[PDB]
């Protein structure tokens, strides 16, 4: 109550903002960036192999 409940709600808000807006956002954006890069990294090699096959043909 009063100061105690104010501290409780402040702790809840701070914890949710630190875990969601700062950390979970970091994991989500890292996951998105990995999704962008990783498979294109193999698509480039697949394109090179396809180009080599086309050159042979």
């Amino acid at each position: 109550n009063d100061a105690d409940v104010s501290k409780q709600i402040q702790q809840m808000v701070r914890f949710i903002r630190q875990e969601a807006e700062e950390k979970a956002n970091e994991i989500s954006v890292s996951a998105e960036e990995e999704f962008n890069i990783e498979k294109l990294q193999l698509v480039e090699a697949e394109k090179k192999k396809i180009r080599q096959e086309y050159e042979r043909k």
Binding site: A24, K39, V43, K47
Partner: protein, 47 residues
């Protein structure tokens, strides 16, 4: 108090678990989508 503080911790843990699953989900989805895209690109070479 202690129970009130525990709810925020549980919500944070659930959000952490969701973020952890998001990595594998995004990786697999992008892999499949870009496999389709690379197949289309290779088909373009035929044209």
């Amino acid at each position: 108090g202690i129970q009130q503080l525990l709810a925020a911790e549980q919500e944070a843990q659930h959000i952490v678990a969701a973020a952890r699953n998001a990595k594998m989900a995004r990786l697999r989805q992008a892999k499949e989508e870009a496999e389709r895209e690379i197949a289309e690109h290779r088909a373009q070479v035929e044209r």
